[PDB]
Amino acid sequence: RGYDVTRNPHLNKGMAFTLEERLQLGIHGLIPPCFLSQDVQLLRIMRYYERQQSDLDKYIILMTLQDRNEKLFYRVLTSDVEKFMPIVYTPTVGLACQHYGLTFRRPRGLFITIHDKGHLATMLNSWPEDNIKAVVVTDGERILGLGDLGCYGMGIPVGKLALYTACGGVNPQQCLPVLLDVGTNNEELLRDPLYIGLKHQRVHGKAYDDLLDEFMQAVTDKFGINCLIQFEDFANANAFRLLNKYRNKYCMFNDDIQGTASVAVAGILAALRITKNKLSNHVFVFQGAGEAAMGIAHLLVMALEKEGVPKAEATRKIWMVDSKGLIVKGRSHLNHEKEMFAQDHPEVNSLEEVVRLVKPTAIIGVAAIAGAFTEQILRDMASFHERPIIFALSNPTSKAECTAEKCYRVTEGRGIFASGSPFKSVTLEDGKTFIPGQGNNAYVFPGVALGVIAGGIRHIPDEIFLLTAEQIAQEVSEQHLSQGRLYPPLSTIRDVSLRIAIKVLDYAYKHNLASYYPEPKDKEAFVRSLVYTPDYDSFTLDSYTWPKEAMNVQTV
Amino acid sequence: RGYDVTRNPHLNKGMAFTLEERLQLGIHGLIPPCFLSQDVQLLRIMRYYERQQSDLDKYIILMTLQDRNEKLFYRVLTSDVEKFMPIVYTPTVGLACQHYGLTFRRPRGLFITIHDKGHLATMLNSWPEDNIKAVVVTDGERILGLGDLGCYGMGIPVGKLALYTACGGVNPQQCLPVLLDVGTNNEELLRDPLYIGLKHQRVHGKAYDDLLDEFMQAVTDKFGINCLIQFEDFANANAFRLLNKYRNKYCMFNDDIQGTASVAVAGILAALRITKNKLSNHVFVFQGAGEAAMGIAHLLVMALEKEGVPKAEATRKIWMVDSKGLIVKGRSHLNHEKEMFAQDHPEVNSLEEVVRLVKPTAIIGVAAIAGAFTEQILRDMASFHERPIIFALSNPTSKAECTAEKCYRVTEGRGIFASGSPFKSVTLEDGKTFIPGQGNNAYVFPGVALGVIAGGIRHIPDEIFLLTAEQIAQEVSEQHLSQGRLYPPLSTIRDVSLRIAIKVLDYAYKHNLASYYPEPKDKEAFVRSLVYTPDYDSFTLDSYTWPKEAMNVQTV
Amino acid sequence: RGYDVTRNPHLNKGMAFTLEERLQLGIHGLIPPCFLSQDVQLLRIMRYYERQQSDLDKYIILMTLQDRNEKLFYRVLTSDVEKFMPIVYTPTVGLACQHYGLTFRRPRGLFITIHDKGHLATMLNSWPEDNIKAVVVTDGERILGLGDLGCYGMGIPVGKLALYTACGGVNPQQCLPVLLDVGTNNEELLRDPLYIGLKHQRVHGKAYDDLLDEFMQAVTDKFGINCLIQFEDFANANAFRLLNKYRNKYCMFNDDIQGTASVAVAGILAALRITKNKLSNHVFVFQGAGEAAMGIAHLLVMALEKEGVPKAEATRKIWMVDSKGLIVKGRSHLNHEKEMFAQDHPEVNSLEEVVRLVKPTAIIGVAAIAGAFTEQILRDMASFHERPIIFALSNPTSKAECTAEKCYRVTEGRGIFASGSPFKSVTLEDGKTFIPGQGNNAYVFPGVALGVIAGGIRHIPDEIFLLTAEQIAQEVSEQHLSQGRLYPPLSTIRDVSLRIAIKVLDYAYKHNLASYYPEPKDKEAFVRSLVYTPDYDSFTLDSYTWPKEAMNVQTV
Fold first, then answer.
1. Burial of A200 (0-12, 13-18, 19+ CB in 10 A)
2. C 26-45 residues with CB < 8 A to A
3. CA distances from B196 to A485, B304, C28, C31, C406 (A)
4. C26–chain B nearest CA distance, Å
5. Catalytic: which of C13, C133, C160, C406?
6. CB contact under 8 A, A40 and C555
7. Which residues have C-beta within 8 Å of that of residue C9, sequence separation ≥ 6?
8. H or E element: which one contains A315?
9. Cβ atoms of C106 and C9 closer than 8 Å
């Protein structure tokens, strides 16, 4: 195809094109006279990558590599996914969003604005790839820890899709990052000469609803109803509203809502293997938030009902506390969702007296307030239940409800701890050394996405996410459970994803949800056939001959 | 896209490109300074078309028009489909096959040979269109009335696909004509300097079976398992064997076997509306052949069982005679299929004495022997049953079992006649004027194909063809039934196809056969959205603006 | 390049693509499984070509072949150029122009209209080839023998360029046929539903002059000042005016004016070899017309001055007669050009008495009136000069000034005859058998065009055409001169063109007219390197390797 082969990141191999490939593709001379394996390209990229003194510069190098040679980009990522996941995605992707340096060389993503309503199909036609299986659309309104970033949020889909392939196995060529720019309510960005967005207040209401309706409709008209559409950092109100709106109409899901809940329930079910106790013999106190503990609570209720527990006594075991006390009948501001987990109980003021009042086996704290798990709570919880469960799932480590070493000291080294912020290994007296598990959304969305794209699943119900949580809980080995670790190491995420992708797939074929008709007998080898690998293809034409008489030139 | 727009038949409009379209596409100057509607282009094509003195020259003009401007080609066809169906398809397409003049200007079709086994996916990649919904593959072994034509048979898929769109509504851009060249057992073609084929004896056996297996596998790998694959004029042995082989593995069907049977049963069910009698009160005598009367018999048995008649007494009403007499228990050479319709009965020698012995209401003659319906048979059949049924379904009019005016005279103008060869209107005494129906395969395969492609039906069972026959039987009006016409006029085929395409579609969604998930509420308007029309598209870019501030160029 | 290779006539070889070429180009399967040499393709085209009963159908086949496979098209033409020159060019090209059947499948030519003034560069951009060396622009106003054809005249450039390559050697890919549609003064075409033109009266005056000025300017801006621009059948007034306008500004020439004169002077100089006499010992009587005998007279005067004859006594030997008698000082309507060849002489009324009065050695009759060379003129001319010269250069054989057998009888078989209309061999008594030469413009314009394009000649002066006439005169062998033949057989035109192309080239480098700088030592082998041959190229990639260590893949 000539010089254009070296500009296509999905085709360009750089100095890994063999001489025959260079001669056949018509690109001989455009590449230095050096023929390299992908391993040498990887070591050269690593040598250049360690020269940087900041995470933003590492991000720039990785995004440039993705713009040049995407197979080498995913070779880099999958080489050590634990060390590049925080660089191409959160936390570094947000710090790069807020501090864009006109980064993306190759157009990476589709910017669809509110002023394009009615012409979204024409904009989808701008994307070069026309066989798209996954779409990660963002609004830029609630970037993790950064707030409203508007059009700067494009790095978040681009990043998360990079994890669809590095962690899952999704082809990074049927993936499309979309940014719906409806304006931004960020005065810092509005008064900025280097802002690349619309520079007006964020549109809301029926115009916004119609924009997203037409977006889902156009994406499914162009790419099929099986196109997996994931909603990225939308505002929690918009997030949950649109999730309930498009849940059963499109192959849509939300990772900030459902992936987080799945990871939390996976940690809980993994801790169940430490306590050697059934989920039915548990009671949960939460720190409810704006669809943060609500999804975890619903998924945990589903896990309870799975064991043959009716929904009534299943939701009986859930208590919610948020800056006001328990959720009892019509306390002050109970909404239609808080009343679902409302216990008819004396109104309790704060956390300490409810942890004392009902003896909890697991406290799941996601409230974005620090130190909410005071020492006395940990101590009397360890006294109540041997081997309790403490979940400081707040993302900002400065705002975590507890800390690893605090939980392990005050509980005398028998409190199963897990967080969402990186806590280093805690070594205590009595030889008690713990590796506290780190809950990561990359455990759920890559495997679920790979299974959904492999099977052509039409809708992603909550049963799929409970199943994902169960598989992740089964991923942890006994050796890691002894170390107090609740999630499998990220260095195995690929394999984990595969397993999830199979189980999900199984479910979809057991409940008539998958569209892929031939119904593979070996779903393991079927999913393995769709897993994208960074290994280079061969660009040499397949030559063959005919049996010497059918091939005759037939001269007169 | 420039000069290449005028070389693409699916895009080129010739002198129907408006000046703005010519300027936007960069083709201004390449087209004469004449701007035409499609009606003027149609009248000019017609004026040039009537200048020809042979049907082969008309075929050359139509194929050239298809190579130039396919929307005008299908405008021509759909303008008067009754007069162009015998030109782009049988009988003229065979006479053009045997007398090729190096016709096809644009590459129209894919020639896959036996010597390409193992590399068929690479050959499928040669086809420019990559979204293919229908594949009409031929072998060239049993072209209608012409015999083994080998690689000359390419005109038959190309022709039949032209009827998929002219009669049905199928997009003639997701249609792919394939010719599997395995050699030819035609000495006239082997010893021919102008033959375009392989020039060796036709390969058979396991090599041929493996070639077709790999062909179906490659077609479904590249184009999906929902790709409709129709088998064209294969040898009847190969035809039926491959039909039973790939019937339930792929979306495959055979029109020479199943479409013919559907048209015959449609004529029978339409004659049922003349006799005002139920199918249960009928007995059928056939002229069995090599899967010609066998398919009609099976479909008629299915029609009988549909009325709550058990299969035993249903197949009781079928008698088969072929140059040997009845099919009674082990007469001389009963196969595994003849024994299915075998009656325990005294062995009868010829046709006359079985028509006398069991009084038949319908004689379905497809045996390729002439005059087999002698005068005495017609007369005593008219005497036995008032308003009998005579079916001379033999294609060569020189070899038809009976004739229109003969059947109408000897039966005293009350014998419902139908054929497969064109019989002109018969005017008799007593003012008896009859328009004998002409059974045409174009009544079945376009509508069935449109329904299958619209609904993504995975397999085409015999119930679909019985349903097609029922719909076609319902297509005939009472005014035409009074004239003794059993099939709707071809000038309405489009509409007929649509109706079939809907009913088929209904069936597929009632029996969980369709893959298209969203499950349209209005299947009529859903199928109408996929019907291809010869009306030109607009090649003008959709221009629009932004609200005057988001569109600001933002100068420093 | 895939399926698009088979749509490019300059690349498509049809069934002459070898299996390796088909596999490398990605076109395997699109072509029948038959591998042919160009000789078999030629014989198949010939077999299909002889089936036609009209010249228009032969023209349609040849134009279709040019639209499919242009190398095979020029193989056909150059195979027997004498039998295809009257089919792809005059006289058949005009009969096809007037009787267009919406012929050209592939866009063949550029239609630039008067309403495109100011945007001609954008229209030149529509032509796919961007390296153009020759442009044959027509107006359609004075098609040979057909009159104003307007936009139907596009076949005339397309035809003449086909002779640039079949007769000359010009690459038919740096050739561009242009039609300047300024309207048409043809009421038959204006009131015609199938006319493809502008359908208004022909624009003239300053608008037309500005259109042609901008056309020459745009053609030379896009394709260089060395682009050879030939003016086709313009009106003689417009023809001569534009010729004098753009003669010394662009590489422009006119074949209806200058090629005709060159062929006539070539016939005269060839007859000089029969009379064994120098041109100085000759006197010429003409039948002057609207720049028909004027160009011949000027070129003949130049030939005279070449022999060291001053211009005065050189033009002394020219006499002009047109329906009024001689051209003497201010007879009735002498223009500024007739006065140049005006002799101070008694005013003569008709032709007979001037042929009697001044004894002419050569009568050059181009006046489009029949029988103007009456028997007595031929007889007394044969009596005056032994071995006279008679030139009935009128194109319509019905309007030729004389006839072959008449000239050969009345002159007693010693009158050197030549015409522009095909006169068959004349066999007379005394064993006198003559093959009268047929003057053809294809003797001049292909060779001159090939030399001009090879050398990058900037302007084509009249010296080049006199030199062309001299070379053509030298082309005739003594054996043909004995038969009374004055022009070489067309079956050698290629070679003739080459020789002309060299001599022209020599002249251009001797008078500092050629732009090609390196100044070839062997101009014969230089021109032979640019001669286009119908032989197919090889589309196989040039594969090679490196010395086993520079080619190492260099694994870690």
1. middle
2. 26, 33-37, 39-40, 43
3. 71, 48, 14, 9, 54
4. 6
5. C160
6. yes
7. C66, C67, C68, C69, C70, C73, C106
8. helix A311-316
9. yes
Which residues fall within 8 angstroms of residue A289, CB to CB, at 6 or more apart? A322, A366, A367, A368
The answer to whether residue A552 neighbours chain C at the CB level (below 8 Å) is: yes
Q: Measured between alpha carbons, how far is B283 from B317 in angstroms, rounded to an integer? A: 5
Residues 6+ apart with CB under 8 A from A359: A283, A384, A385
Q: Say if A350 is an interface residue toward chain C (CB within 8 Å).
A: no
- Which stretches of A317-374 are DSSP H helices? 351-357
Of C399, C401, C398, residue with least CA distance to C418: C401
Helix (H) or strand (E) holding B2: none
**Beta carbons within 8 Å of B64's beta carbon, 6+ residues apart:** B105, C64, C105
C506 is an annotated ligand-binding site residue: no
Tokens of B42: 């149609």
CA distance linking residue B19 with residue B316, whole number of Å:
69
Nearest to B181 by CA among B223, B211, B210, B161: B211
Interface of A with B in 505-524 (CB under 8 A): 515, 517-518
Contact C454, C530 (CB under 8 A): yes
User: Which has the closest alpha carbon to A468: A310, A254, A269, A288?
Assistant: A269
CB B442, CB B165: distance < 8 Å: no
Q: Cα(B105)–Cα(B102) distance, rounded to whole angstroms?
A: 8
Q: Which CA distances in Å does B7 have to B62, B74, B173, C125, C161?
A: 17, 17, 15, 17, 21
Q: Resolution, in Å, please?
A: 2.8
Asked if residue C265 lies in contact with residue C462, where contact means CB atoms within 8 angstroms, the answer is: no
- The answer to whether the Cβ–Cβ distance between B198 and A550 falls below 8 Å is yes
- From the list B23, B27, B198, the residue facing C33 with the nearest CB is B198
Cβ neighbour number for residue A276 with a 10 Å cutoff? 7
Q: The tokens of C348 are what?
A: 């003569």
C510 is catalytic: no
A–C: how many Cβ contacts below 8 A?
A: 61
Question: Does the annotation list C55 as a binding residue?
Answer: no
Q: Tokens for B114, please give them.
A: 């036996």
Across the interface, do C39 and A555 touch by the CB < 8 Å criterion? yes
Q: Beta partners for A365?
A: A392
A552 contact residues in C (CB cutoff 8 A): 35
SS3 B448: helix
Tell me which H or E stretch contains A426.
strand A426-427
Q: Considering only CA atoms, which of C377, C374, C358, C351 is closest in space to residue C318?
A: C358
Work out the number of other CB atoms within 10 angstroms of the CB of residue C78: 18
**Across chain A, which distance is largest between two alpha carbons, in Å?**
104
Q: Chain A: nearest CA to B469, how far in angstroms?
A: 28
Q: Determine the distance in angstroms separating the CA of C555 from the nearest CA of chain A, rounded to an integer.
A: 5
Q: How far apart are CA A518 and CA B249, in angstroms?
A: 9
Q: Is C537 exposed, middle or buried (0-12, 13-18, 19+ CB in 10 A)?
A: exposed
d(CA B276, CA A27): 76
What secondary structure does DSSP assign to C363-378, as a single string?
EEE-SS-TT-S-HHHH
Verify cis geometry, omega within 30 degrees of 0, for the bond prior to C489.
no
- For the record, the structure tokens of C156 come out as 């005339």
Whether B197 has its CB under 8 Å from any CB of chain C: the answer is yes
Per the annotation, does B537 bind a ligand? no
- The alpha carbon of residue C77 is apart from the nearest alpha carbon of chain A, in Å, by 19
Residue with tokens 């455009």: A30
CA distance B232 to B245: 15
Distance of alpha carbon C77 from alpha carbon C88, whole angstroms: 9
Q: Which of B365, B387, B397 is nearest to B297 (CA)?
A: B365
Query: Which of A264, A174, A262, A267 minimizes the C-alpha distance to A223?
Result: A174
Residue B229 φ then ψ, to 5°:
-115, 115
